[PDB]
Design a protein around this ligand. Structure first.
Ligand SMILES: *[C@@H](CC(=O)OCC)[C@H](C[C@@H]1CCNC1=O)NC(=O)[C@H](Cc1ccccc1)NC(=O)OCc1ccccc1
Ligand SMILES: *[C@@H](CC(=O)OCC)[C@H](C[C@@H]1CCNC1=O)NC(=O)[C@H](Cc1ccccc1)NC(=O)OCc1ccccc1
Lengths: 181, 181
């Protein structure tokens, strides 16, 4: 569990930022290059505040599977000259399951806070706030608003991005390797 | 840093609770027996909500040093029949300094969240929100309200209780062994 936190803390320090869109404040993970990722419901506009700085969003892909079903992630390419440490190698090919995960959040409400959400099982199908959604990971932890974009980790693994919950369970969209090249 | 988090998580699970008084919501650490501890400014009343349950407070000691100077901790004895796992052995005789600390918080705003506040140095004297105060530990972390009563830890050590900050530094009252027998 320590090693997971240890990984979590170096990962967030190296690849995360706090983002403001018009839909709220979110944690954001840079994946490679100038591409990062947000929960879909961050509905990012044509520009964003990234660590308190205006950044224009070159592109954005609201992800759905073949049958078109909601996956709940948006990817965005950012005109900044800086390139994110490529972490694609940490992203799995299919939904991961771990016994001890850490959820990492980096915003104004929760600056650099980590939550031992313990055990994460592929939940799969979920009707999320009315929306048919798939590829969800589920963890037993009493999650809260302001936590979206939160990064779900174990040692060695970026498992996905936090997108919802209700009182005593939370849910991440699984962050799969092939969403980027 | 992992081992610190690992210690933090077992400690909070075993000895912490979420407390409501009329002054707000706080993290509370049970020390031994029926004695726990709150930041002074929790100003606890004759009864408290401990994990959503009314508990009457048998006694309360607002701690000051010899010269009478503010220490900013209140200790309280609780009529519950349950006895806290005695953790007095984890409390140092003088102000600790560590290179890697974790701050643990357990309330409604922050349920079971941990913050790697890194390096903690005895700050000593501080005029805290107008109040002359001593025995403060200082950490460089952008702390927030709702974090008071937060427990400051490294591996093996309960260092003290979170009591304030301003933007980019936070401060705990050092939690010393002799405050209890
Ligand atoms: C994250 C929102 C956020 O970060 O705010 C920015 C300022 C929030 C996390 C969630 C809130 C309470 N506990 C949590 O873990 N996300 C949601 O609330 C999420 C929002 C959403 C997204 C897509 C579509 C609809 C709504 N929804 C959510 O948690 O719904 C609860 C739920 C769970 C299972 C079945 C149905 C509904
Ligand atoms: C904790 C309050 C809390 O948990 O609320 C319950 C619902 C809060 C933490 C603090 C707030 C912003 N960042 C932080 O880390 N504590 C205080 O705000 C603390 C309150 C207090 C206590 C005793 C006397 C006066 C005030 N005060 C504080 O942080 O003051 C800032 C400061 C720092 C250095 C010098 C002077 C003033």
């Amino acid at each position: 569990m320590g090693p997971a936190f240890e990984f979590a803390v170096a990962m967030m320090k190296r690849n995360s930022s706090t983002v403001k869109t018009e839909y709220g404040e979110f944690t954001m993970l840079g994946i490679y290059d100038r591409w990062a990722v947000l929960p879909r419901h961050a509905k990012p506009g044509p520009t964003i505040l990234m660590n308190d700085q205006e950044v224009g969003v070159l592109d954005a892909k609201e992800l759905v599977d073949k049958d078109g079903t909601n996956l709940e992630l948006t990817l965005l390419k950012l005109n900044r000259n800086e390139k994110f440490r490529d972490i694609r190698g940490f992203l799995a090919k299919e939904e991961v399951e771990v016994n001890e995960a850490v959820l990492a959040i980096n915003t104004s409400k929760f600056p650099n806070m980590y939550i031992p959400v313990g055990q994460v099982t592929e939940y799969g199908f979920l009707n999320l706030g009315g929306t048919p959604t798939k590829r969800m990971l589920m963890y037993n932890f009493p999650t809260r608003a302001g936590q979206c974009g939160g990064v779900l980790m174990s040692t060695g693994k970026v498992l996905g991005i936090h997108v919802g919950g209700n009182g005593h369970q939370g849910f991440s969209a699984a962050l799969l390797k092939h969403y980027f090249n």
